[PDB]
């Protein structure tokens, strides 16, 4: 195909959700919201990554939403643009 995910295994939303097993207790966004926005946990801090574009986000702030931060930083991601 003409696009290709940075992480094919994390193609699955269920696989992304499982990655949050050890999501830290101070990290306020839910695994559900993050995984739905294409994001999985990298295992470091509160840093997540998109399976599609490969963009990484950290240092989440109160009021942040997963989709709006994903689209603001990585607007040309195929997952963002396919939503």
């Amino acid at each position: 195909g003409t696009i290709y995910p940075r992480n094919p295994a994390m193609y699955s939303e269920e696989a992304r959700l499982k990655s949050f097993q050890n999501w830290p207790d101070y990290a306020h966004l839910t695994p559900r919201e993050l995984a739905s926005a294409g994001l999985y946990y990298t295992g470091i801090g509160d840093q997540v990554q998109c399976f599609a574009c490969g963009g990484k986000l950290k240092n989440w702030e109160p009021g942040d939403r997963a989709w709006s931060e994903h689209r603001r930083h990585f607007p040309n991601c195929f997952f963002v643009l396919g939503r």
Binding site: Q47, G55, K56, L57, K58, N59, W60, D64, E69
Partner: peptide, 4 residues
Amino acid sequence: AIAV
């Protein structure tokens, strides 16, 4: 959030 910030991009890495």
